[PDB]
Amino acid sequence: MVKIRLARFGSKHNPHYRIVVTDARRKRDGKYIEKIGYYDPRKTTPDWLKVDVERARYWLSVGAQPTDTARRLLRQAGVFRQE
Amino acid sequence: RNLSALKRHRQSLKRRLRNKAKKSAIKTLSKKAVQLAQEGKAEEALKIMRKAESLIDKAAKGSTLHKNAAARRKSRLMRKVRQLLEAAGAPLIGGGLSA
Amino acid sequence: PKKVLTGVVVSDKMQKTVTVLVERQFPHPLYGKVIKRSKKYLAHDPEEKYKLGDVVEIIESRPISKRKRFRVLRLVESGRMDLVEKYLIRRQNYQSLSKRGGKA
RNA sequence: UGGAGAGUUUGAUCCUGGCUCAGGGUGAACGCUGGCGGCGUGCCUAAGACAUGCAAGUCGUGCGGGCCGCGGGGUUUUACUCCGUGGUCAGCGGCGGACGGGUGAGUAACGCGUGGGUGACCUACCCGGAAGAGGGGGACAACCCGGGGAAACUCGGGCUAAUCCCCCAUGUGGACCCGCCCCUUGGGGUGUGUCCAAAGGGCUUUGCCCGCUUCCGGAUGGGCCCGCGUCCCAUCAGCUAGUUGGUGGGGUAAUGGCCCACCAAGGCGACGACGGGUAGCCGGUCUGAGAGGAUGGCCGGCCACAGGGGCACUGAGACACGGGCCCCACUCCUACGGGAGGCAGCAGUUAGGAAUCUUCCGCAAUGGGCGCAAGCCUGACGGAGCGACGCCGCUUGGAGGAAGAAGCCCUUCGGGGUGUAAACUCCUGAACCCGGGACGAAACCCCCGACGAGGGGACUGACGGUACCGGGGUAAUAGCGCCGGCCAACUCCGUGCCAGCAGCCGCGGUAAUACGGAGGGCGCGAGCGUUACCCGGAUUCACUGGGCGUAAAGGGCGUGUAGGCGGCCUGGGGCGUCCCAUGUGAAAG
Numbered sequence: 093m094v095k096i097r098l099a100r101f102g103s104k105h106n107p108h109y110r111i112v113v114t115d116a117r118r119k120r121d122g123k124y125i126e127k128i129g130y131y132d133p134r135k136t137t138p139d140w141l142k143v144d145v146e147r148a149r150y151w152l153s154v155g156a157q158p159t160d161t162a163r164r165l166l167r168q169a170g171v172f173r174q175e
Numbered sequence: 176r177n178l179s180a181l182k183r184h185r186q187s188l189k190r191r192l193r194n195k196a197k198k199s200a201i202k203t204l205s206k207k208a209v210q211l212a213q214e215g216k217a218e219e220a221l222k223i224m225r226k227a228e229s230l231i232d233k234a235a236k237g238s239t240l241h242k243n244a245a246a247r248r249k250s251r252l253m254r255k256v257r258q259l260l261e262a263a264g265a266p267l268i269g270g271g272l273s274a
Numbered sequence: 275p276k277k278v279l280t281g282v283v284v285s286d287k288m289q290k291t292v293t294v295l296v297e298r299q300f301p302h303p304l305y306g307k308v309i310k311r312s313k314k315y316l317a318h319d320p321e322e323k324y325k326l327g328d329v330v331e332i333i334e335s336r337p338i339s340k341r342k343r344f345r346v347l348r349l350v351e352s353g354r355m356d357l358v359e360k361y362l363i364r365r366q367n368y369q370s371l372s373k374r375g376g377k378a
Numbered sequence: 379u380g381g382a383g384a385g386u387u388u389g390a391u392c393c394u395g396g397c398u399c400a401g402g403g404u405g406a407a408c409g410c411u412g413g414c415g416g417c418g419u420g421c422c423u424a425a426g427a428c429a430u431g432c433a434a435g436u437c438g439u440g441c442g443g444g445c446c447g448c449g450g451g452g453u454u455u456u457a458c459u460c461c462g463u464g465g466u467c468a469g470c471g472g473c474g475g476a477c478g479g480g481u482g483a484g485u486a487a488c489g490c491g492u493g494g495g496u497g498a499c500c501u502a503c504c505c506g507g508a509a510g511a512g513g514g515g516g517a518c519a520a521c522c523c524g525g526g527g528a529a530a531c532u533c534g535g536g537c538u539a540a541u542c543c544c545c546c547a548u549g550u551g552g553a554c555c556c557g558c559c560c561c562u563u564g565g566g567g568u569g570u571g572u573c574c575a576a577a578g579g580g581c582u583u584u585g586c587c588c589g590c591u592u593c594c595g596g597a598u599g600g601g602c603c604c605g606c607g608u609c610c611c612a613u614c615a616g617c618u619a620g621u622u623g624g625u626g627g628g629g630u631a632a633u634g635g636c637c638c639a640c641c642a643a644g645g646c647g648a649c650g651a652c653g654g655g656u657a658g659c660c661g662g663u664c665u666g667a668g669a670g671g672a673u674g675g676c677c678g679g680c681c682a683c684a685g686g687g688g689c690a691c692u693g694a695g696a697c698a699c700g701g702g703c704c705c706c707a708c709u710c711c712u713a714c715g716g717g718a719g720g721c722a723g724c725a726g727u728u729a730g731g732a733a734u735c736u737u738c739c740g741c742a743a744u745g746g747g748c749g750c751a752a753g754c755c756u757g758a759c760g761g762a763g764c765g766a767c768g769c770c771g772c773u774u775g776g777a778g779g780a781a782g783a784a785g786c787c788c789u790u791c792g793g794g795g796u797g798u799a800a801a802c803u804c805c806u807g808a809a810c811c812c813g814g815g816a817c818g819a820a821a822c823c824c825c826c827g828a829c830g831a832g833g834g835g836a837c838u839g840a841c842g843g844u845a846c847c848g849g850g851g852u853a854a855u856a857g858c859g860c861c862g863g864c865c866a867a868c869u870c871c872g873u874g875c876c877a878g879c880a881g882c883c884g885c886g887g888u889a890a891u892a893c894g895g896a897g898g899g900c901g902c903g904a905g906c907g908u909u910a911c912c913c914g915g916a917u918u919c920a921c922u923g924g925g926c927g928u929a930a931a932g933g934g935c936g937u938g939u940a941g942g943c944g945g946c947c948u949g950g951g952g953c954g955u956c957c958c959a960u961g962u963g964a965a966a967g
């Protein structure tokens with residue numbers, strides 16, 4: 093099914109993931125359906141994680157299944173927070 | 176060597192014979208109805224047609240016919256039978272055709 | 275949108291099918307001058323309603339056969355073999371240009 | 379914000395004109411040379427052949443067993459026999475094996491690009507919604523018994539479970555025929571008739587979880603069709619009979635001669651059919667002032683292929699690289715009857731070649747498959763290795779030091795050069811030593827809380843004792859090409875049309891700035907040259923941006939077909955053309 097997962101975009105020893113919505117079957121770095129965020133594991137800048145909850149929620153509402161790390165990040169940005 | 180994908184193969188043959196079988200029946204009963212109808216025997220033709228209809232749907236119950244493949248057979252069947260009966264018939268047993 | 279084209283009926287010698295010669299104009303990709311290029315479409319005619327010289331609109335359709343993926347929409351204006359003539363002569367002119375002799 | 383020209387045809391001149399150089403680029407290769415590091419990149423040839431290991435499995439929460447344990451019962455005791463539990467093996471059953479990874483052989487094509495069409499369609503797993511799962515029956519492995527074979531394995535006989543197969547029921551609904559209605563190419567609704575459902579499992583058991591069934595829809599992925607665009611040869615001009623169309627049928631998820639029977643006689647071509655050559659296409663890449671030329675490695679998208687040819691089965695999906703069948707070539711085993719194979723997966727071997735790497739580390743991260751989960755599997759991938767192959771960073775020292783050492787070197791022998799270069803003085807301190815030492819990892823999980831939101835906790839690093847930080851600390855690789863003009867840089871000597879240079883002009887037949895060496899010099903420097911190839915300069919195919927009296931170029935002349943082109947006024951249309959809005963123009967670049 094369609095997923096919300098991380099696509100690798102940094103450089104050697106300089107990982108920079110790109111949180112994308114893609115079909116489960118594509119290369120992890122292949123053609124995605126939509127970019128809905130980014131994530132710098134090493135937090136090299138204050139802005140090491142953006143998400144756009146609006147969109148993350150649209151895909152979740154239509155099927156998109158996030159990987160474990162994907163939701164960990166989506167949650168950290170309050171995608172599932174309902175308070 | 177030796178990869179247990181051999182299993183999928185075994186499995187496919189059981190499936191093959193199973194599908195192959197159901198279809199044989201379908202075609203056999205279909206031709207059967209198309210025959211009695213062609214001979215104007217409305218009563219027992221519709222009788223058999225119903226069996227053919229039934230077998231077709233059941234075949235599409237699992238992965239033997241499925242989709243709209245079943246629907247064509249049925250259509251083509253009800254069509255030929257009803258037309259062939261247009262040679263003095265009157266849908267006697269009033270099987271699956273709707274007056 | 276299903277492409278709609280307008281052309282002339284050059285062939286009629288076919289059952290439930292007519293040939294529509296469609297022209298188009300465009301600037302040459304390198305030399306600029308506007309040039310006319312044409313193409314024949316085999317269009318569907320279930321009622322054999324159109325004849326030679328009929329300028330008809332053709333619409334993109336669901337395949338009717340190999341070659342036939344267009345149906346005749348409507349008639350734009352009829353009778354006019356001046357258009358059929360160009361095609362015919364240009365067709366007959368093919369006798370001269372070859373290896374064998376021909377009173378083209 | 380963008381455009382430089384030069385040498386070379388003559389005694390000399392102008393022009394024409396070709397050749398050649400200066401620039402930039404490359405999956406490079408070769409020669410001489412070679413210190414460190416980051417990031418990229420590396421069979422371009424025989425799509426030659428491949429040893430070996432690894433490259434796809436996973437579920438005991440679908441099912442029954444076999445072998446090996448441990449333990450508990452029936453019993454007064456034995457035999458016998460009942461239950462529980464651990465490991466293990468395959469089997470049945472399911473999901474995955476149609477992805478991910480490889481290569482461009484084929485293909486000049488709706489293959490690809492771009493814009494559209496599908497009332498001609500499909501889509502497992504995921505999401506939303508509606509309805510539901512009542513009863514009965516059956517078989518085949520495993521296992522057991524026997525038979526044929528060297529083996530691969532194959533034949534028969536018996537028993538058995540299930541989310542395995544079948545029947546009956548319920549029919550939300552849906553399928554099909556006929557009718558009617560709305561739409562209008564097979565879209566939606568409706569009525570009668572007929573036809574079609576289901577699977578069970580798990581417990582933090584008498585509910586909740588995982589799952590099952592039919593249907594409507596979403597999302598994603600995909601099939602098919604159409605306009606336009608996509609190389610060379612016309613010393614390839616005619617091509618075609620499934621051919622073109624029709625009717626009926628078959629087939630498919632679906633249109634279609636897709637396939638078949640029958641009928642019609644068509645269809646295509648100079649706006650280049652057919653035939654031959656070559657070639658995977660694109661985003662882009664290189665070059666160019668631009669127009670354009672060349673190109674398609676790496677990365678991303680599409681296609682195609684998996685020893686060559688054909689074929690279909692199973693599946694939501696394959697005509698299926700590590701599935702099946704047959705033919706062919708080949709390797710291998712052989713008890714010769716007959717069998718086993720297919721690295722264009724990673725790595726590696728061998729062959730070919732001018733030439734292209736480690737039979738490495740890890741699944742810690744991201745991604746994928748299966749599982750409730752634990753977790754298992756992932757040569758996808760993340761890393762390290764080798765190669766100046768490319769790009770960037772960096773070092774081989776810093777400051778002082780004679781009107782100037784030695785040697786070499788030229789010399790009008792007086793001096794001139796190498797040279798502040800060296801020596802030497804002082805300063806710093808690449809290497810290397812010692813110490814500390816990461817980010818990448820927080821989730822899954824478990825506890826609280828509703829298996830939710832939210833809060834809390836624990837486990838987890840291949841790279842790696844690496845990066846980086848701090849202390850200590852030695853002056854410690856230099857090379858290559860060139861110096862007649864173009865083209866930055868000149869002298870001596872040897873040689874004597876020889877030996878040899880040479881990109882183009884051209885050098886050498888005894889005073890050679892052009893050969894060879896030397897001193898000196900220029901250029902670049904961990905590289906410098908060479909060869910090859912692409913674009914430029916080259917307005918040297920000229921669309922931008924050229925020509926044809928005598929330089930290459932007017933057809934020997936005419937007639938005329940297609941085609942190209944077309945006077946003045948008005949009106950309609952609005953195709954070309956122009957304008958506004960809007961959609962599209964993936965990411966990377």
Ligand SMILES: [Mg+2]
Binds near residue numbers: 203
């Ligand atoms: Mg039969």
Ligand SMILES: [Mg+2]
């Ligand atoms: Mg010249």
Ligand SMILES: [Mg+2]
Binds near residue numbers: 387
């Ligand atoms: Mg002359």
Ligand SMILES: [Mg+2]
């Ligand atoms: Mg001269």
Ligand SMILES: [Mg+2]
């Ligand atoms: Mg060396």
Ligand SMILES: [Mg+2]
């Ligand atoms: Mg490297």
Ligand SMILES: [Mg+2]
């Ligand atoms: Mg190759």
Ligand SMILES: [Mg+2]
């Ligand atoms: Mg092997």
Ligand SMILES: [Mg+2]
Binds near residue numbers: 432
């Ligand atoms: Mg492995």
Ligand SMILES: [Mg+2]
């Ligand atoms: Mg015991």
Ligand SMILES: [Mg+2]
């Ligand atoms: Mg097992």
Ligand SMILES: [Mg+2]
């Ligand atoms: Mg692939």
Ligand SMILES: [Mg+2]
């Ligand atoms: Mg060809």
Ligand SMILES: [Mg+2]
Binds near residue numbers: 488
């Ligand atoms: Mg196609």
Ligand SMILES: [Mg+2]
Binds near residue numbers: 496
């Ligand atoms: Mg559609």
Ligand SMILES: [Mg+2]
């Ligand atoms: Mg869809």
